[PDB]
Ligand binder design. Sequence first.
Ligand SMILES: *CCC(=O)Nc1ccc(Cn2nc(-c3cc4cc(C)cc(OC)c4s3)c3c(N)ncnc32)cc1
Length: 291
Amino acid sequence: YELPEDPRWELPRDRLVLGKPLGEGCFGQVVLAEAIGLDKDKPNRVTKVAVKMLKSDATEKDLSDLISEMEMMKMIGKHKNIINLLGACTQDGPLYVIVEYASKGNLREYLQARRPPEEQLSSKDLVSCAYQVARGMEYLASKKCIHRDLAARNVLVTEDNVMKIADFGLARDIHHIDYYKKTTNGRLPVKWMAPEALFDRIYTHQSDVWSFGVLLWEIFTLGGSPYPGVPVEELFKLLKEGHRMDKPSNCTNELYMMMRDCWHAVPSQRPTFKQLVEDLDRIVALTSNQE
Ligand SMILES: *CCC(=O)Nc1ccc(Cn2nc(-c3cc4cc(C)cc(OC)c4s3)c3c(N)ncnc32)cc1
């Protein structure tokens, strides 16, 4: 295309063995792939990766959107609990953005597939999950990054059960959001949005912390759906009345209090991810490994 060369991230196209499609492409196709010698000093080892590209019916805007996302991830840098940029194919052909591969689906799927009628998750496991996501967000927020759709569906799990935050650099115009548009699992994304983001369309770090509360709720409900049966029209009314989601069963009062604090009507009174990390850190060391 028209892309400038960047030797920091460029990978020769014959070092990328393309594989099977990973999920179905929403705004851009994602495929599994194998990269030969990503490590500059380990050139004879293959690494499983995820590759994002443009559909056939892709605009110039779609192109620029993919470029934007790649450039942001370059800036933000690497962290254990986010899907990291590994490289890119920008020269002589279609744009390929290469990121880390998570073999165990998103967090919602991961949690549902381990529901009691694959080994179950202990009480410590669930809190540990919350801790990792809180760490990924702490780092992202530290790099002045706002996710705007923090949820279990946007949290992926590696083969080593490591929570990695996805789509943190996704280019999204928040003035076009179809509030009635559902996800492919049939849930309304407006149920993760803070009130000031849902009404005044004001996205901040604090609005992400609101979303982390709903994410917390998803975790201890083992992938439950927030506000089942509730349409957009009624969710508006619920938030006006200051209504909050009920406490999940098999969830401590301390952790529910954490959700409630995340769902503080006044943004300034919500905890920071820095606090949430410290709290969850202490809770992990006080949560039984025997469920
Ligand atoms: C809206 C429907 C849809 O697109 N669903 C969907 C597509 C693809 C997968 C599989 N999948 N995606 C990813 C990616 C995660 C990230 C995270 C960041 C931060 C950036 C980025 O691309 C630049 C991607 S792509 C997967 C990874 N990383 N590993 C396995 N599967 C992945 C699921 C759902």
